[model samples]
Target: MNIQALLSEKVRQAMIAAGAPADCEPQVRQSAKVQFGDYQANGMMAVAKKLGMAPRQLAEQVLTHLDLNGIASKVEIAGPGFINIFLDPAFLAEHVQQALASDRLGVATPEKQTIVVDYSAPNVAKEMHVGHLRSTIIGDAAVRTLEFLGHKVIRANHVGDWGTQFGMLIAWLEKQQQENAGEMELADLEGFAERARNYVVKLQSGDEYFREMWRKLVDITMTQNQITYDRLNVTLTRDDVMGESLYNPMLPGIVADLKAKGLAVESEGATVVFLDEPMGVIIQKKDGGYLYTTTDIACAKYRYETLHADRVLYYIDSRQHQHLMQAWAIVRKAGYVPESVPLEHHMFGMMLGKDGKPFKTRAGGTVKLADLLDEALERARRLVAEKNPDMPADELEKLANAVGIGAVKYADLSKNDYIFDWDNMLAFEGNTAPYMQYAYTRVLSVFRKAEIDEEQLAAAPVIIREDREAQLAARLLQFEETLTVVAREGTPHVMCAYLYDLAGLFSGFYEHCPILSAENEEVRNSRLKLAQLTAKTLKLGLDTLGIETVERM
Candidate 1:
């Protein structure tokens, strides 16, 4: 299963027996050069230098003690201290067969951990825009992975349902209330222009009236935005939200506690936290207003003590680098977080247009995320209709929604800061969602056309007899390693890239070996098993990525 870990451990043991330093831990990986071997241990040279020995001599000595029984068929010492490990094909075949039989595909679950993933903070009464895409997709992918590996994942949707922006909406709501206007009347803000002057109330007025109004506006916003979240296939519920408005009640105590600790003081006519020798950060405004930083600190404390988070990841944009750093510095000085607990800022770059600018609308305004999703659906809907005109209207709509939204999420997740190109992203080929979806459909098509029993196909033993079949099976086995890499690196792109490679490999295998038309019944059944596993692995991978897969395309 974890071939790399086994090889790494073996190399370290070999080094120890070879008179190498006791502190040395060898690094081993799957070799890029297949002719050299399946895996390579490059740590011998480094370990040999630490022990004052010749690299090649130490490598040879390591091989003398290296125990790779039943794993590698051949082992060779390459130039310098490189150890090339060639795995036995039959050994690989046995593991691949085992993986096919097991539900886990021979990949073991990871050690359990409680982690908080912060993302998708859509503002109340505002459209979820392009900016929220990366955070939502990235955080979702991470949470899926953590959950799959048996971690207790807490999804914190630190929504922008707080702050001064709500003040205007609240003010308008209060006016509507005083006028004995129906509550639903304020839900439509089209006439907001008429009450511009009256809507300028500051959020500092955290009165019962303001609270009442804020709740109403939030109810309206949440109800409408829930649809978009469903469209995007995001699983976050209302309970997941930890909005800024909720922190309003905690700010007074937060300010007092910081001041009592001498972390905060009067500076530039506001209560601020000073870092270094000394740069001041405002916690409260000159007008006795609480800042986002104040709320952020309070939120962190609440998550640390109340949520019992071992780790908290802030999946925010790259532009907030300075602010995040400043806040993190304060968090360190305040000692709110434990020494063992890590607070990470997983910052990402902006999605750009062909012009290399932040993606925007034709009117030069920020595009609504809902609108962008709708646009993708409208474009994909026509294509789906043209491909299958006989489908029922509702079925067609649903399929189009899956393809369209899946395409949008994939386009963003495939490459961070990648330029938005409709032609490339919406294509039915070349690493696009449609291509992967079609590949899945192709597998199902084989099963249907072959008139095979689904149960029998699943029960069939997998045997890699051909070159492409071996390569395909090997790639499928590496899914475990690929997921490990993605989990370690916190990137969904790796998973997407892997799925793309899998789909491409499946295509090659499908072409090179005919599953439905095989001469031998056993060979056909084996190929069918491979196809079934390919579909299963790909669907699982896509589902983890927050993308939906269809039976047909």
Candidate 2:
């Protein structure tokens, strides 16, 4: 039912039958250009280059032998040697019917691999912030995409619950206990945080006593952080809390493993792993302290060998590219990961503020994630009250949280990692989460007005017309394909973009093609079915992206 795949296969077979080279099959790449045609193959240009003939002549020869009548409505040789292909509406409609009949939306399941995605690694005890937002939303989308494509996806929340900061936090807690005579309350939690921050500052400034206290405090805070993290729906275990401190115990073993494998050697009094040509070396600090690189290498190796993961993906900031590359090279050299095992660092750009700097509060302080979320929810409550004044206070509050959080998640997932702009991040405009949610609400309204039973629509034929109706149907059918591309590229923005496209198409179709008021009964039922399907897909997609869609307003 994949028209692009079908057409590509047709071109591939035609090339082989035309006595093309053996490797020529892979060269047949199909592309869709709105200006040119629906799909185009540029393989003839390569063939012409080798044969010393005019590209257009070679393309003409290839076209004469190509039998694509079943897949393409029109095939033309354009611009030297490009084969432009346009699929017939009747053929596309058949795929649409097939998609409507099936649950997977016509997406083919390829070879499934065990993919472990490490993301949303928020530090324990610290409230989830914007720093954790991208990883959670983007990683959730990745999990959904991989799962949809039949891959075994592991959602690893590498929460940071162990570290030197714990030492200070724990020490401060003890001080608070002494001051409060062992009567600790929830209010003491903020006092513990304040004292912990103070202790850390003192320790960082080379206070030996504070440093010693900090280490012991770390042990205590680790336990406290574990409790806090468990309450927040985090699934990571105590054993998985391998922070920078855990790497300390394994540094010697890692260095030996690298040396034993000839991956690392002494460089400037420090152990270093040199990357392949054109890439630099990764230096393990001269003081012999393990770095992020060392820890990542250890983690990657453990995940591959112990977890038996076919793919290991790290969700981190783009600034750490070099560190990841070095770590990846070192892990590869250890001979634990197979060359075919996919190892990737899904890097995202920093989220900037209105002043074009990294996002911060008006007070020039780092914005607390909990505070930001609270603000969003508050604004959402106001918006909900304005839009749906009849809703009860409790329902309004619940919907606000869903919509506000969804808006934040959707905004982050809507763009490429590197294009984060704070000014536009939370805008609930044309292509925003609110817009998609509104479309879903409108579709639900249609059902309510038509008095069509959900059971009946579920069993009816979804007729697709030749205009915007067909476009929306076709877009819906491409959901699986879109997900596959997003997972492969490690880009959730692609899925967000696709959802927005579907929403826009649905809106246009609804404007012209009346769903409840169509002249023909068949047409009305078909349009209504399409509307219901659109709403369902949108809600499913929003859920996968960790966003919520409101049923009303």
Candidate 3:
């Protein structure tokens, strides 16, 4: 159960009963310190001012109307009528027990929505690079979170599989095939690069030869991309690819419709849409070639009309913010996607090297994603081997893959531009993935030491007597709160921070409170169940971020 949300609603009801506005905010938040109790309501002063009543007097009236009978044990009014609430230990204990028994850990399912998440838009004929890492994993985390909350999540890969460049690429592929030579890099198209425009016309006009060659290029690139997606544990599959090619047929109709609606006009012989921003966005060039904005406009229209998506989230980088805004402005004016449907641009910053520049190889080339993952695996292998020399080779390899891949994904799951620090991300002590994975195994160790079947402890009665127990119990129930925020905001960093704090709290509770050797049988079982829930929470939280946890780390 979400205690914070529960408390907020109850306090809001009490404020309205005390003659406050019908739309008053409760402003309930978790107490920052023990002096403020477990939770506090700070909306009293604002409500009192709106009612022209004394803040303390309004707080008293609100308390009389409040119905936190079994939820909170004590309620007091503090400075300026701030309502401090102390949760009942017994109430926490009972909820903890119920949470342990439920498979979903008492997380209430939210209203299901058909959410379309556009992410991992890697282009055809280009190898995946470090730049693709953020959108891929971070977007996957969002997909997992929305699904866990009972939403009908649609994973849109939005691959860049259609363009004039594809014509040049196809010509190069045909040349290589005719020569019966080994595969060569597309960048070395010395001869065909100069004649790309002619090939583009042929490809656009449905030349069967170029079309077959273009399919080969796309297939080869996605075959390799699928391997990376599998290695990263992302949920994206081949069927999820709603590439630019899919919207190609719709672009002409979209541009024509926009022109008819007067949203798009001819500017300098190019189809353009003038927006409030000081620029005209080109939908088509003078040569009648479509641009990215044109395709994006078609994609948005399809998502709204054909896909019937209630919400659409684009997990693109921050640099593309203006591009998206321009296309969406046109999309709205043309009435393709209504204003009621949310078109969120969940933009993230770039990834840089530790020196605060573009991440590159020693030779100053882009870092290929495959090579980066292989390096992570090698480093993780050595780190795990040094700690456990006798560990079997098979298990060592699996553990290394988990830690290595987990570290790489976790480091990039943030909103701001992140520095690629290998040592820092792989370290065992900080908020790295290894630390959280190890913490999960450490919590499981308690069950091993106690020689008890954790599944049987579901019926055990939890007693929150110690301060640490109550603290841990309260934090454990906040899992849904954290999940809801991450799902709504498309911010995986919040999940990372929450898991780290929860692990730290579990560590403190483990050291201060005795789980297996408590004085009473009921208390020992209670603490064991608490640890069980902690382990489950860590695993589930990490799972939502596409991070794997092992029984033993």
Candidate 4:
């Protein structure tokens, strides 16, 4: 079902038959332009060099052995041995029909593995802000894609619940309860620090009062976070809350084991591990406390040993790249997590304002995620109401929520510091969420205007005669191909770009190919089936991104 993958294998085999090394790569890719054919194999030049033959001469031999058969209508060497494959229209039409009949769009599920995704790690006693948006949605999209590909995914919230800061928060809570105090009451810094350190030891030592206060802070923060998660359609649940506290118990054993293994040594009364990189990771402090690296090392070990994770993905931002590198270095040296189990750091950029700075409130404080959603809803409600004045109140409410939240989430899904612009995100054109949603509704309108029951549309053989129909069918069949890329690279922006292009192809087809006004019922039904596949593809693609599509937009 993955056309590019299929072509890559076939081409790689042919290169071997043509006397190239068996390990040679085909370097097959979807062609960037139409004239280059549907897919191109660019591995010939390298293979030719290995075989000690001219590139064009090697291409000629590979062509003799290349067996595209019924799949590609034409396969030819162009411009120094690059193979261009023009697919058969019949092959595309047949596969598009198969995709339409299948619920999962004919995507073949690969070998399953246990994938642990760590994302949206909001800290205790603090509100999530724009800082957490990229990790939450981008990581969720990766989870959905992996699940769709039939992988066992473990979502790790990785909250900051175990830290000395909780001591200050607990102390403040106790003071507030006793005095019924107002927010931000004045306190002595030295006194607070001493009490915080003592409270940390007591809390770890099972002091009932401190433990209860800590629990209250965690409970309150998670309860508030559930609202934001629900609004964003994130897949994480209460069961996924794997905070620092969960791994705190394992820290001492981890540090001691590293010291016993000779990977860690006492340096200035602290446990440190020297790495090939120019840094010494501190695992335990001079005060007999653990550092962030200690917890991370323990967390990695637990993920492999307890959770049996085959792969671990961290969706932290780019600022913490070196921090993660240091911790992972310690983990590798201690033999806690083996090199076979990959610890991937999928870092991302920040969200900036129109002035090319980090997003902030008017007074330059951090913006709350809740307040951001509220503004998104308001902007979307006005945009939808302005266009659909006759829409009912309840329907308008639902549409506004989908469009507004989707706009905000989609805008941040790109892996770069983007200028947050409401007008651009809310626009009903180009690659914006509104445009894609409207494109889905537009396909539904075909059936709406024809008074035709989609389920009742007579099955007819798809005939790809027009160029637009062929173009649309080819793109529809490449859904699995696009999904494979997104899943492998953990990039939701690829899916976004794909869905945007699919919508554009559907527009061209809808404009040129008449569905209801065809020459006969067979042609009309065939066109209807193409349109049907387009709707299903759009809905499935958007669903993977945690973006919703409505019946009418």
- Candidate number that wins on TM-score, 2 or 3: 3
| lDDT scores in order | 0.77, 0.67, 0.85, 0.84
RMSD of each: 3.2, 5.1, 2.2, 2.9
lDDT of 3 by residue, 242-343 (tens): 998789988777888887877777888899888886768999999897887888888898998988899999998888887788898887877889987889
What TM-score do all the candidates reach, one by one? Answer: 0.90, 0.84, 0.95, 0.95
Clashes per candidate, residues 3 or more apart or on different chains: 0, 4, 0, 0
**How many clashes (backbone atoms < 3 Å, residues ≥3 apart in a chain or on different chains) does model 3 have?**
0
Please, what are the lDDT tens digits per residue for candidate 4 over residues 1-553? 8889888888887877777776779999988788988989899887777768899888878888888977998998789888999998898989988887788989988988999999999987777767888889889998998899899999999998877776676666766654553333222222446766677778987678778777777877787788899998899898899999889888777777787888877888888889996557777889887877778888899999999999998988888787788999878866778998899888877878888988899999788898999999999999999996888899988999999999988886654456788878998977899999999999988866775565666466888788788888999989998888887777888888989999999888888788867788767878888888889999999999999788987
**Considering every candidate listed, which one attains the maximal lDDT?**
3
**What local lDDT does model 3 show for residue 181?**
39
In TM-score terms, candidate 2 sits at 0.84
Q: What is the lDDT of residue 312 in candidate 4?
A: 93
lDDT for each residue of candidate 1 in 148-261, tens digit (9 for 90 to 100): 877888989887776555545665665665556545432243455435433435344545565565666777777656677788888777788888766778878778878789
Identify the runs in model 4 with alpha carbons over 4 angstroms from their true place: 176-197, 451-458
Candidate 4 local Cα displacement, residue 484, angstroms: 1.3
lDDT for residue 433 in candidate 4, whole number 0-100: 92
